[PDB]
């Protein structure tokens, strides 16, 4: 009676209490103090209220399961519809509205039609923080902001991940490739699954480009989910000396203006020899030139370095595969890899000429 | 897109259950037919507290102020502080944080700053001794409300450090198919910026009402001296009844004001407590909301808790209607099979809740 009254939701709650016989106010409703005084002058109404480990865990969970059964043994449309509903092995029809045309048009019964129920978390989007790994049999290394198709829960979706490292647990700063044989972190805009769920990732899902190699590229688990990530890429500002004394030097071009040097005063720099230093004051007439002080006398063949950090953003890109809405259901094509784009529009790969290593030979070091 | 509610009732419970469930809601007609219509300042600052606690949740107040749009986000916690207004004490803002408190990335270390007590709200001793043990046996183990200083109304000036530091996955399934035997009955009588004899007058009034029941009565006494007393005179009394074999508790509090006799207030809170014992069964009339909220966000099992006839009310069933309105779950009230009293046993099958914000 009372449950039907509670969940019959076209009648007022005081009408439920009336035909059975507001929460900003925290403390509940009491009588008048005089009525309560004459009511509780007596006391006798409430005087009777006053006065192995593995098998143990399995026993606790089977105790909960028998509690589940013996409390399910109740009203038939209560159990079998609304208090739990359709346990397992129930044969159901399930109707979806606004299913696309292409499914019904191109429905080929070879390809299975699987459906899975999303949790409250898995309908949310945002940055998923994983730790992943180039799969040991995938040949080529993976690159940040190259798409790969993830299989994260029920969904398969192509995303743009960016591989990070917490370099001795200080930053979470941005790599440019995945490592060769171990795990890195990663962050991709996608549907937020729960933490500790595993996933695969694939470069190429089609069959025209299926090649001869191994097709699954990345493996990993999900570490954390969030609405925002704060990851950085290192930028150094390089400048060269042009007037050197003992223990101090005038540094030429890492800044364009004395306002910029004023913005950066007191910062610690270093040469490539590891000589630590500090910038002290902007010089007046040559504009981006400043005066720095070092540990000792630096040389004219050095480069000073201001290690700073620039924030980088994940790219909010997400397309699910929708392979069953195609006329071929293989041959799904998404965003291409960067080498594929360069091969398509014939751009040469970017080569900084002074980034290439050489064979340095030391001259012998003699002093006066 | 939005689950729609009407009126400014149960406002904190609606925003709290929307944050738990992750469902976008609208609350329409916030006192629209009124002389100063719209949201009030204390519930606007509660929205600011929700934006402090969560991250990525967008709240969208209208022009007229009479409808709010809450699209929730991830509970992240962190350390914060909240300078809540004089319209409501710190209990009005620390009560709805005890639901969101164990389900965040980083542990709750917030300190609220304002009035400590009110007639129609939760106190420090209320929050602590009543509402922390039901969480303590629903699954959390490290939760603490500290008073650094307390401020009686109207000027207040008291700070309260809510720290929860057990980030559980989900609350356990409750099984309370008994009425817990009350082992002791204790309490705390506090007074700030007044004479220390008022506390003993309150204690003597409460215990002369309590003296005829054959249990053991113990009321602790604190006067607050110095900067810890706050900016205003005040005094109040909070009794709990303590079932020690399981840990259950039933509380009742109030505060005195300008013209109030302390023996009168002590005996009033004592009789109000005994009536809560009468109208209580394994919970209190005010511990019952978050008890059944933790039962409904437990595991995907059946959890059952005994309640009595008089705990059913318009507040309790409007709570149940809001629960079913947000995440589509029903309670099943089965009666006990013995007939010297009218007690139901509410079985709730909890939704499949986990906290997905805590990093693994």
């Amino acid at each position: 009676n009372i449950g039907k009254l509670i969940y019959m939701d076209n009648i007022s709650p005081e009408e439920c209490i009336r035909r059975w016989r507001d929460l900003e106010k925290f403390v509940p409703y009491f009588d008048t103090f005089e009525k309560l005084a004459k009511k509780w002058k007596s006391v006798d109404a409430i005087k009777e209220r006053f006065l192995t480990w593995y098998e143990l865990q399995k026993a606790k969970i089977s105790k909960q399961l028998e509690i589940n059964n013996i409390e399910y043994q109740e009203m038939t449309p209560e159990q079998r519809q609304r208090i739990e509903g359709f346990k397992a092995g129930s044969y159901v029809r399930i109707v979806f509205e606004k299913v696309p045309m292409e499914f019904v048009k191109n429905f080929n019964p070879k390809f299975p039609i699987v459906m899975g129920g999303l949790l409250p978390t898995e309908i949310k989007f945002g940055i998923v923080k994983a730790r992943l790994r180039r799969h040991r049999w995938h040949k080529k290394i993976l690159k940040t902001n190259d798409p790969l198709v993830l299989s994260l829960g029920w969904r398969r979706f192509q995303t743009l991940p960016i591989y990070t490292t917490t370099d001795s647990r200080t930053r979470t700063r941005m790599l440019k490739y995945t490592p060769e044989h171990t795990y890195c972190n990663a962050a991709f805009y996608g549907p937020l699954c729960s933490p500790n769920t595993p996933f695969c990732g694939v470069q190429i899902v089609a069959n025209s480009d299926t090649g001869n190699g191994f097709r699954i590229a990345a493996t990993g688990i999900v570490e954390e989910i969030d609405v925002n990530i704060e990851i950085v890429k290192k930028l150094k500002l390089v400048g060269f000396p042009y007037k050197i004394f003992k223990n101090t030097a005038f540094i030429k071009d890492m800044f364009s203006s004395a306002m910029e040097v004023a913005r950066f005063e007191g910062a610690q720099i270093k040469t490539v020899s590891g000589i630590r230093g500090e910038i002290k004051r902007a010089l007046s007439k040559p504009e981006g030139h400043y005066r720095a002080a070092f540990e000792d006398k630096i040389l004219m063949s050095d480069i000073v370095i201001l290690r700073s950090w620039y924030p980088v953003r994940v790219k909010k890109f997400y397309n699910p595969v929708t392979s069953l809405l195609l006329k071929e259901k293989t041959e799904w094509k998404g965003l291409r890899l960067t080498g594929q784009i360069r091969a398509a529009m014939n751009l040469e790969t970017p080569s900084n000429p002074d980034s290439a290593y050489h064979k340095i030979e030391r001259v012998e070091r003699h002093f006066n | 897109k939005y689950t729609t509610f009407q009126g400014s009732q149960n406002f904190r419970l609606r925003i709290v259950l929307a944050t738990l469930s992750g469902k976008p809601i609208k609350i329409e007609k916030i006192r629209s037919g009124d002389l100063n219509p719209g949201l009030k300042d204390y519930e606007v600052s509660f929205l600011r507290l929700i934006e402090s606690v969560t991250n990525g949740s967008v709240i969208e107040i209208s022009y007229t102020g009479t409808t709010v749009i809450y699209r929730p986000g991830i509970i992240v916690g962190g350390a914060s502080t909240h300078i809540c207004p004089s319209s409501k004490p710190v209990g009005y803002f620390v009560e709805p944080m005890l639901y969101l408190a164990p389900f965040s990335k980083k542990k709750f270390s917030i300190l609220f700053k304002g009035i400590t007590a009110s007639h129609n709200d939760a106190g420090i001793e209320a929050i602590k001794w009543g509402l922390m043990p039901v969480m303590e046996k629903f699954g959390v183990r490290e939760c603490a409300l500290h008073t650094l200083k307390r401020g009686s109304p109207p000027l207040g000036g008291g700070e309260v450090h809510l720290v929860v530091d057990s980030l559980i996955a989900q609350p356990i399934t409750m099984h309370e198919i008994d009425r817990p035997i009350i082992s002791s009955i204790t309490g705390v009588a506090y007074s700030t910026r007044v004479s220390p004899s008022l506390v003993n007058r309150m204690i003597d009034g409460a215990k002369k009402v309590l003296k005829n029941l054959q249990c053991e009565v113990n009321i602790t006494a604190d006067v607050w001296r110095g900067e810890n007393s706050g900016k205003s005179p005040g005094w109040g009394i909070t009794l709990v009844a303590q079932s020690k074999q399981k840990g259950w508790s039933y509380f009742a509090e109030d505060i005195g004001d300008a013209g109030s006799i302390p023996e009168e207030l002590g005996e009033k809170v004592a009789c109000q407590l005994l009536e809560e014992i009468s109208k209580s069964a394994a919970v209190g009339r005010n511990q019952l909301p978050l008890a059944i909220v933790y039962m409904v966000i437990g595991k995907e099992d059946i959890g059952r808790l005994r309640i009595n006839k008089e705990q059913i009310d318009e507040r309790f069933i409007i709570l149940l209607r809001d629960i079913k309105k947000i995440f589509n779950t029903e309670v099943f009230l089965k009666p006990v099979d013995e007939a010297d009293n009218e007690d139901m046993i509410a079985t709730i099958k909890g939704i499949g809740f986990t906290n997905t914000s805590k990093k693994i």
Partner: peptide
């Protein structure tokens, strides 16, 4: 420092 890693905000149109 309070703004630095937020993503929400109340939208007070009053």
């Amino acid at each position: 420092k309070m703004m630095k890693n937020k993503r929400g905000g109340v939208i007070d149109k009053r």
